[model samples]
Target: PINVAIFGSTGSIGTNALNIIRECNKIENVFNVKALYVNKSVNELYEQAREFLPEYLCIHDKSVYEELKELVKNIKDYKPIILCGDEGMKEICSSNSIDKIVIGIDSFQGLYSTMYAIMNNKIVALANKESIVSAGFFLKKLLNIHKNAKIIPVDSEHSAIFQCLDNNKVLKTKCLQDNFSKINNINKIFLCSSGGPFQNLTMDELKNVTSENALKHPKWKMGKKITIDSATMMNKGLEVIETHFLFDVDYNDIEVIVHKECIIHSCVEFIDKSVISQMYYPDMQIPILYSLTWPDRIKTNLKPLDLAQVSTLTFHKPSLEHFPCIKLAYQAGIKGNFYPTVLNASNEIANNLFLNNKIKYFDISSIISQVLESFNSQKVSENSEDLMKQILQIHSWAKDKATDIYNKHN
Candidate 1:
């Protein structure tokens, strides 16, 4: 059986991944649940443990470790190796027992494990854009050394792009070949956006917008952070960087448009001016299922996307004035050192501040821009270890600076 590990076992991605696992197993039992990790959702963790019966369970919060243990202690015949904190993550990630890992952890928390899995030569079904956005330079270098390892993108847009290319035989660039000849036959990657909730809001309306209304997304029900990211169009921006890394497409070759009806998850264009795309019902499971069982297709019970019922899909360019984070992300990605890291760190703070109503909607991009302009230091790293350390150090610096700016605004 192929051993599987899930890092964010309680989030939407993890839950959906588990669902796909369970569904696929009903047809053929191929994956054995090996490990599961969660930050603080011990109750849900306990429930997932009972169902999956993994050998190892890790929690990020030490206080909740006791609650998780007590919940699982009485379970019959399951003597799982329970653990907690950074050491636990290292243990699970670095271990050779696991084959495929679902890295659904949202922020820098997942980068360590994802990189470790890549280093150890495993199939990494990567979901978090932050991991690639903050560390694309180093990851690209690390990937070249570990040839057997593969990074199968799980983001809807990137997965769509991978499927299009994979079906077309241009798929070897999955974190290994940065400049493959076959990939050059393509011209552009069309990353589709739902235009977010605030796409039509005037600048004055955006300034006064409340977080409540912002969280009410149109197409997909996602986590608060990504939902708010979607509201600000920053999600697409970060994904643009992810697209750049996962596919090695030039920043100039990537384009994002406001496709309010998100049925067309993503599209690609070739030199011949013809376009091909992957579309389905707006469900994360479709892509998640693909990431799990790639190079092949599996029968799923998901609802087929009925294009006839949905007659129209509209498209347009984004308003650079209204949503500036996408613009900031492009600038940072093109700058290509620690600029992407700073962009993520600043945006994480500003996104949280907006979620808590500490900052307004428009302030999300404003804070990000301010942090980017004031950042004026280059941290060098002779080795991969030093590179990661410098990147994380810059991450903290950006957070503190964003915090100070948020302080004065309060």
Candidate 2:
């Protein structure tokens, strides 16, 4: 059985992952839910712990410990060690019992825990884009040293490229660097997007768009922050940077297209002019399951994709004119010093502001752009520890800067 730890067990991705595990367990005793971690959802975490009965539980928000403890008291059948705060999260991730870690934790807070898992040489099924976008270079260095460490992308687009490349023999070695180089025959990778809810909105329409409108994604159901990111097309841009680091492809070689159908998740082209793509219904379960059982396939109860029913799939180039956040992401990604770090941090602050109705919809990208421009010249370090510190410092500065910009406008 594959032993697993879910880092964000109460979030959308984490809950879906749990469902996959539950279903797979019924078919065959394949996954042993070893541990669970969550930030502040005490009731959800308690429910997960009761159902899975993991060996350990961690609450990132220490203040929730007493509440969690009281909730756990009602559980009569099973008892597990409870932990709290960042150190607790680190301990759970570093545990020797865990063979794989499903990193579904949101934002930059996941970075340190991910590093800890990598340091312990755990197989990471990663859904946290911010960590990769902020520290891809540093992560590459870590993977090189830990040789046993592997990161299988859990995001649909990255997972699609992974599945396609695996089937096409584009990826051969277990080493990430080698896998990245093994696909030298590849010409370009196409990361398909659904163009989000604001796909057809005029620039004037965007200025007055509300959070409720932005949250209505055209394709997939996701968390609030990510849905907002989707509306801005910044999510796709972040995915581009993530694809670069995960596949070790150049920024220029990565392309994004507006695929309204969302059927063809992602595609890759070879030097021979042959293109390969992975098509599936818009669901997170498939990718999450794939991450759990790599180098093998399992039967899932999910409805299979039917091309006949899909009828037609259309693709177009994303308009950077309306979605300037996409342009800003590419800019930060290409600049590649501490720019990506600044981009992610600033975007997080701006995204939260928009979500809380503290800033106008268009101001999300504007705030991010201003912060990126402000921090354009900061040099990034090669050392992992130093880079992490730099990232944290930049994150703080960008949040404050973005908040200031929002206040000025309001």
Candidate 3:
């Protein structure tokens, strides 16, 4: 059995992954749940532990360890080992028991496990964009050395782009050892965006928008954090950086356009001029399923697309007046150092504040812009240890800086 470990197993992506994993075992039981990790959702974790019967059940919150252990004792016949905190999470990511790790954790927090899994020669089905956005520099370097480590993008846009590169079979084997050296047929990558709920709204109009309105994305059911990121277009902004890293595409070569229907998840144009686009009904499960069973296609219970119903797909340039975060991201990604780290951290802080009703909708982008403007770094450390330290320092600094900026607003 292929042992699969799920980090952040209680969230939207993790649960969807489990749904697919459960489907994988319907008749052909090829995949086994080796570990399940969560933070603070002890009850849900307990329920999953009993149902999945994973070998290891872990939690990030140390305070709930005793509580979860007590609850799991009610299970009969099999008992999984209980683990807690970052140490427990590290064990799951780096251990031999895990073959495939689904990184569903939100934000840059997932960066740690992603690094651990790859360095230890495990396949990572990465769903978190922040990790790639912020740590792509170091990760690209790491991948060059650890040729066995593979990072398969699970995000819809990245997945779509990967498929569009369809016949470029080198990636399936290279593990980026050559870093786009062998597969250089791509011309430009057009990342499709729904432009969030407020794509048409002006800057002044966005201030009146509430979290409730932002959370209700026009397409796709996702976690609360990402929903807001979509509304502000910061989510799409971050993906731009991820695209650059995952594909080794030039920051200048990537473009973002608003696709109203979202039928075309994303598209790539070649040097020869033909454009290849990946289209499907706006279902998150489609990408999640492909991430699990990659290189080979499989049937899932997901609804097939009715192209007739999605008859008229539309596209337009994103208005910078409303969604300035995309511009900020390009600026950061182009800078290619601590800039992306700062952008990720500050955006996380500001986005959380907006979701909590502590700030206005436009303030999400405003704080990110302000944080970028306030901090400037002249040099990037090439040493991996120093690079990691600097990223962590800047991440914390950006959060504190953005939080300070928000406090002044109050």
**Model 1 pairs in collision:** none
**lDDT digits (tens) for residues 1-410 of candidate 2:** 89999999999899999998999888888999999999999999999888999999899889999999899978888778899998887788778889999999989887878899998999999999899998787788788878888888999999998887754453355424645734556678999998888888888988898888987654546788899898888999899889878877778988999998889999988778789899988888889999889888887777778899899999999889889998998899888887888899899998988888888877888899999988856665777788777778888888898888887888
Clashing pairs in 2: none
CA shift of 377, model 2, Å: 3.2
Clashing pairs in 3: none
For model 3 the local lDDT of residue 376 reads: 86
Candidate 2 displacement at residue 361 in angstroms: 2.7
* 335 Cα displacement, candidate 2 (Å): 1.2
TM-score for every candidate vs. truth?
0.95, 0.95, 0.94
Q: After superposition, how far is residue 159 of candidate 2 from its true place, in Å?
A: 0.4
Tens digit of lDDT per residue, candidate 3, span 1-410? 77899898999899988887787678577778999998889999888888899999999989999999999999898778899898897788777878899999988889988888888888898999999888887787777667778888899998898777764454454333344623757789899998878877766787799998987664546888898888888999899988888887887888998998889999988888789999997766778777777777766656678889778999998977778889999998887768888899999998899899998877888899899988887477877778788888888999999999988979
Off by over 4 Å in 2: 167-171, 174-184, 218-220
